[PDB]
Amino acid sequence: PLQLAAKMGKAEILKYILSREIKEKRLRSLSRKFTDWAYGPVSSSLYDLTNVDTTTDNSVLEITVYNTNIDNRHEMLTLEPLHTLLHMKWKKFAKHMFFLSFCFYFFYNITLTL
Amino acid sequence: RRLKKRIFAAVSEGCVEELVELLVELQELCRLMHKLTASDTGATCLMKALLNINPNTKEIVRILLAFAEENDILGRFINAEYTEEAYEGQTALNIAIERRQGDIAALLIAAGADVNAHAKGAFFNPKYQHEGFYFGETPLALAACTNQPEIVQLLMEHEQTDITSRDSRGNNILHALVTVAEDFKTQNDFVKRMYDMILLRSGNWELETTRNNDGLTPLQLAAKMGKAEILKYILSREIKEKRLRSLSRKFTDWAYGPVSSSLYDLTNVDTTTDNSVLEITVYNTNIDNRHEMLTLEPLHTLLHMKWKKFAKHMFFLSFCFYFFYNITLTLVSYYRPLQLLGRMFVLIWAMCISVKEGIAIFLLRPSDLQSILSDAWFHFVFFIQAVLVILSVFLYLFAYKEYLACLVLAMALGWANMLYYTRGFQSMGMYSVMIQKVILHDVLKFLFVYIVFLLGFGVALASLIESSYGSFSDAVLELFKLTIGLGDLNIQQNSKYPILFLFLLITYVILTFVLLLNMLIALMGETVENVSKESERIWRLQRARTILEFEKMLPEWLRSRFRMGELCRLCLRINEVKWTEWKTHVSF
Amino acid sequence: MGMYSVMIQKVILHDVLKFLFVYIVFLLGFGVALASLIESSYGSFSDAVLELFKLTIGLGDLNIQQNSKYPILFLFLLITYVILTFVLLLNMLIALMGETVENVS
Amino acid sequence: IAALLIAAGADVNAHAKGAFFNPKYQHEGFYFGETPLALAACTNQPEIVQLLMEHEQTDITSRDSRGNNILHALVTVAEDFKTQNDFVKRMYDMILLRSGNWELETTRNNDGLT
């Protein structure tokens, strides 16, 4: 159901499923977000990345990024745990890979021109 | 270690019977600090119960307090604090105040909880505002920032507490409230009302005169952080109660309909001391509500008075002097082989401008000054022009031949520099900020894409020619001439592939003339509208900066003579008429 | 046509005057800059300002060989003038006059 | 207190010709008409203006230093913008109806204007 919501482009249902908190006993297992400690505006939360991370063959992040028949892609991408995951994946290796590709292509073009 | 785990589990769950049985077992084993304190974060059973409060948390807290009293260790546990390096200084009273549990908070205060406890954890005073929560490292400051009137009143009524306490940052309750306050005018503003309440309950000038390690009063701190609402409230404060009128900074003398005369206070507002509110709000570069803060008394009237006193005359004198200097330089250089005197005047003024710009650059802030449009480009260009003039003179004194190039660059820069003097009139300050914003926004990107495409097509064209497109420089010159609209499009250029050459030329024409130029027109139109909606504020800020610079440039004796203010403290009398406000008040 | 007449009046009184003033400022500055380093066409100040005006309006030819002492400096000054006037000032005047046209229409 | 003073014999036709009262600029002072009746009219006091009108020792055709009467003063004080609450028009109507004569609307000041 989560992947289907991501594919069809339902931001509200996607956000509800991704960030779901249950405070009842014996039902907390159904939740995907657990609040560890809260102090005013600061809040630490453990999210679940079963079908959200790009680990399996098909993932929610890959579906919402590679979707071409949707219009709420920005709305779906600007919510946890997708925004933080994207920034982490960027700052880990994507910036370095992009800079390396830039340098390699620039040197290749300069060599061809010369 | 099982007993401590059982105690913690019972405290977290809230089972009264289980907690009582565990306490009985602990008492039997004893017949306690090591078993009650956890080394994970240096917490305690009371802290664990308050962090995980439940519908029966009051009973658990009462049972724990009774057990501590029976063991005669309650006073030992009241002063318990976190031993970790992240949230050091936390206490049960602090947690109870944060969790808005007023009954338990009052119970802890009555039981002897530390009121003046300082929570100096690293997470509490983070370097960035988004990296942590800062409240003041004090239960009183936390109650003030968390909007608990009952709890803050109960703390204030206590005898063991203090008000003049300064935390690690040096900030007191008023500084903490100023920092926590929101610049935007929200519908519900509790910080201002509770600041008023705390100041009235204190009833002394020590709170508003104390300086932290940054050497700022609460008013100066509000001006620096950019809180228009708090700044206006502090600047225009009226108290009608007896023995409390001294705390006010604005006194209404007489009122007759819309006309009202008011004496304001200029202790830290006038540019008299080393640091002043006006100087802070004018020279601030990391704020966005500068126009909102500057458009309120006693800053607007003070700025207009300081202008009309001497700043207009100084600006006109500078305009005339610079215009005559530029005219003399232009005439002297153009009439190249009365001349000696003109050259001497040019040299003297160039040296003066160079040294003044050097002092200005040295005294200017080296951070974020060049990134923002804080009148740094004009200083840089003036210094560069003076350096060019003096270098041209030195080279003419010698036998070198670059003096002519330096001099022509000097006249070009100086004649392009007259626009700086168009900020005196409102009709042209908008034009100057238009130039600045458009150039900084769109022209740079358009130009960059232009050289990219131009160089690409130039090396493409110059390589397949076995006439005019001989070398790379000739090809790029011809492309530029075709773009700007001169020359002729000759298809017979002795090319190996005439059809390919024509195709490349037509592609370049479509890319540049059809797309790029009209695109730049559209982008610059959008930018013009956007920053013409917000140009008056920028012009006013530039005028205020010029006024303050001229005021600082004045000598010692002239500053004392121009110091305007009637003693009562240095009060300033302002007559204000608000016809719209008077009509709205009287129509009720 | 009354709307057209008031359009003429408002646009001329608002934007054309300021654009023109900045134009003569930059034009005279660059003219005296160019006419002083020539030891061909840019002989005197009047000839230099006429050539600059012709280059701005879009006639003539951009001849880089003007018998100048510093050809690179002359070319740099000419390109700077072209960027300042053609790229920036004219399209800026277009944008400002568009905003004024909407506002007073 | 105003009614008490009127009943005690306070001057009703007293003219307040102070320089601040008739300033050259509208923002340099408060202009109401240099008359207690004109001030009551401009300050939106229906009860006080009615009590003054019902008095016998008062007059309506009085002209101040500017030559303006109550109607001219109300016109000057009135706001061009159509505000939500417009009291000047209603009280102008009330005063004109209570006067019941064409002398008020035909008198000209030193500027020669009705």
Pairing of strands B250-256, A42-47: unpaired
Closest chain A residue to B461 measured between Cα atoms?
A113
N- to C-terminal Cα separation, chain B = 73
Query: In terms of DSSP H, where are the helices of B238-337?
Result: 277-283, 290-294, 300-306, 312-334
Kindly give, in sequence order, each residue whose CB lies less than 8 Å from that of residue D15, ignoring residues fewer than 6 positions away: D34, D35, D64, D65
Q: How far is B585 from chain D (nearest CA, A)?
A: 10
Closest to B583 (Cβ–Cβ): which among D20, D30, D79?
D79
In contact, B422 and B431? CB cutoff 8 Å = yes
User: Residue B265's beta-bridge partner residues?
Assistant: B571
In contact, B520 and C87? CB cutoff 8 Å = yes
| DSSP summary character for residue A24 | S
CA distance D20 to B143: 51
In contact, B139 and B105? CB cutoff 8 Å = no
CA distance B139 to B399: 77
The overall longest dimension of chain C from CA atoms, in Å, is: 55
In chain B, what residues touch A41 (CB-CB under 8 Å)?
A: 133
Determine, for residues D30 and B587 on separate chains, whether the beta-carbon distance falls below 8 Å: no
Query: In terms of DSSP H, where are the helices of B492-535?
Result: 498-509, 517-532
Instruction: Give the determination technique.
Output: cryo-EM
Q: How far is D87 from chain B (nearest CA, A)?
A: 7
Q: What is the DSSP string of D68-110?
A: --HHHHHHHHS-SS--S--HHHHHHHHHHHHH-SSHHHH---T
Determine, for residues D44 and B586 on separate chains, whether the beta-carbon distance falls below 8 Å: yes
Q: How far is D78 from chain B (nearest CA, A)?
A: 10
CA distance C97 to B494: 45
Sheet strands (E) in B503-581:
566-567, 570-577
Q: B245: phi > 0 → left, psi -120 to 50 → alpha, else beta; which?
A: alpha
B399 CB-side CA count, 13 A? 0
Cβ-based contacts under 8 A for chains B and C: 103
CA distance B478 to B488: 9
Task: Report residue B504 as tokens.
Answer: 């490349």
In contact, B314 and B550? CB cutoff 8 Å = yes
Q: Give the residue from B241, B218, B240 showing the smallest Cα distance to B230.
A: B218
CA distance C14 to C7: 10
Q: Give the residue from B268, B282, B273, B161 showing the smallest Cα distance to B208.
A: B268
In chain B, what residues touch D85 (CB-CB under 8 Å)?
A: 587
Closest to B411 (Cβ–Cβ): which among C32, C91, C98?
C32
In chain B, what residues touch A39 (CB-CB under 8 Å)?
A: 98, 133
Closest chain D residue to B578 measured between Cα atoms?
D27
CA distance B403 to C73: 13
Q: Give the residue from D70, D73, D60, D54 showing the smallest Cα distance to D6.
A: D54
Edge to edge, the sheet with strand B566-567 lists B250-256, B259-265, B570-577, B566-567
Residue the block writes with tokens 């190039």: B405
Closest chain B residue to D78 measured between Cα atoms?
B583
User: Residue B255's beta-bridge partner residues?
Assistant: B260
Interface chains of chain C (3 or more CB pairs under 8 Å): B
Task: Report residue B92 as tokens.
Answer: 């049960």
Task: Report residue B352 as tokens.
Answer: 């003066």
Closest to C30 (Cβ–Cβ): which among B412, B438, B486?
B412
Q: Give the residue from C49, C57, C48 showing the smallest Cα distance to C90.
A: C57
In contact, B247 and B304? CB cutoff 8 Å = no
In chain D, what residues touch B583 (CB-CB under 8 Å)?
A: 79, 83
Kindly give, in sequence order, each residue whose CB lies less than 8 Å from that of residue B260, ignoring residues fewer than 6 positions away: B252, B254, B575, B576, B577, B578
Would you list which residues of chain D are within 8 Å, Cβ to Cβ, of chain B?
Answer: 20, 26-27, 29-30, 32, 43-44, 79, 83, 85, 87
Kindly give, in sequence order, each residue whose CB lies less than 8 Å from that of residue C105, ignoring residues fewer than 6 positions away: C3, C7
Determine, for residues B133 and A37 on separate chains, whether the beta-carbon distance falls below 8 Å: no
Closest chain B residue to D20 measured between Cα atoms?
B259
Helix (H, G, I), strand (E, B) or coil at B299: coil
| Angle (nearest 5°) at CA B444 between B440 and B448 | 165
In contact, C37 and C72? CB cutoff 8 Å = no
Sheet strands (E) in chain A:
33-39, 42-47
In contact, B422 and B428? CB cutoff 8 Å = yes
Q: Is C60 annotated as a binding residue?
A: no
Q: What is the DSSP string of chain C?
A: -HHHHHHHHHHIIIIIHHHHHHHHHHHHHHHHHHHTSB-----SHHHHHHHHHHHHHT-S---S-S-BS-HHHHHHHHHHHHIIIIIIIHHHHHHHHHHHHHHH-
Q: How far is D26 from chain B (nearest CA, A)?
A: 9
To test the contact with chain B by mutation, choose from C22, C32, C85, C91 the residue with the greatest count of B C-beta atoms within 10 A, namely C91
In contact, A60 and A72? CB cutoff 8 Å = no
Determine, for residues C28 and B415 on separate chains, whether the beta-carbon distance falls below 8 Å: yes
In contact, B363 and B376? CB cutoff 8 Å = no
Interface chains of chain D (3 or more CB pairs under 8 Å): B
In chain B, what residues touch D43 (CB-CB under 8 Å)?
A: 257, 586
Q: What is the DSSP string of D34-61?
A: SSHHHHHHHTT-HHHHHHHHH-SS--SS
| DSSP summary character for residue A51 | S
CA distance B536 to B530: 12
Closest chain A residue to B130 measured between Cα atoms?
A42
State the CB neighbour count (10 A cutoff) for residue B357.
20
Q: Which long-range contacts (CB under 8 A, 24 or more apart) does B152-156 make?
A: B152/B194, B152/B198, B154/B105, B154/B106, B154/B109, B155/B109, B155/B115, B156/B198, B156/B201
Binding-site residues from annotation of B for Na(+): 485
CA distance B171 to B222: 12
